[PDB]
Amino acid sequence: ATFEIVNRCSYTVWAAASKGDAALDAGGRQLNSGESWTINVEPGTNGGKIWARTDCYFDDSGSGICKTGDCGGLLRCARFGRPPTTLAEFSLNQYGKDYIDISNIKGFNVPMDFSPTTRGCRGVRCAADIVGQCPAKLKAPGGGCNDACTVFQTSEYCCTTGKCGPTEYSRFFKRLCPDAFSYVLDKPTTVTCPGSSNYRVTFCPTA
C-alpha cells in the first residue's frame, strides 16, 4: 500500500512511520514545508502508525533528537515516538478490510488529515488548534499537548485495568477533535476501508 505523506505546515517536520518493532519503509524522513514523501507499507501491516516530529536535529549518521515524537534518537524510526504525537493509525488487510483512525491518546503535536486516495471510505481529520488551547497542566514545555496518561500516570487516564471512563482531559481533546480517539475506551472513530486501499497523510491540512 502506498501512503503519500504531505507536509502543508509552514515549518519543517520529520515524518515517521513504524509498526513499533520495525520501520515502515525507511521509517522517517525530513519534510520541508510543502514536500511530499511517498512510502510503501507492506500489505497486512497491523498496528502501523505515522506521525510528525518537530524541532529535530540529526548528525550525518542519522542520530539526534526531536522535541516531539522522538523515536530513540533516530531519523529512521524503528519504534514508536515519544509523546506528544498526533497519530495516524492503521491496520491493513485484516480479513479483507483496512482500518484507519486518528488518535490523541498519546497527545497532540501537529494537526493532520488521514484520508484514502482510493474509493470506498472516507477520511478523518484532527486540525483544531489543540496546542494553542491545551489545558495548562497538559502543555508540553518541549512543544505540544500531552495526554493525561503521560502527565499523571494513573490507572484512570492510562486505562490500565481496562476499565476507565472519559475525563476532563479526554473531553478537551474530544471537544476539539471529535473524530479522533481521546482515550482508550472512547467510542471508536475507526473507519473501515476496502482492503488494500491507498492513503494520504497531510500535516497542517488547513494552514
Author numbering: 1 to 207
Sentences from the paper on this structure:
Among the sweet-tasting proteins, thaumatin is ~100,000 times sweeter than sucrose on a molar basis and about 1,600 times sweeter on a weight basis. The intensely sweet taste of thaumatin has been widely used not only as a natural sweetener, but also as a flavor enhancer and for masking unpleasant tastes in the food and pharmaceutical industries. Site-directed mutagenesis studies revealed that six lysine residues of Lys19, Lys49, Lys67, Lys106, Lys163, and Lys187, and three arginine residues of Arg76, Arg79, and Arg82 located on the cleft-containing side are responsible for sweetness, and two amino acids residues, Lys67 and Arg82, are particularly important for sweetness. In the present study, three mutant X-ray crystallographic structures of thaumatin (K78A, K106A, and K137A) were determined at resolutions of 1.07, 1.07 and 1.01 Å, respectively.
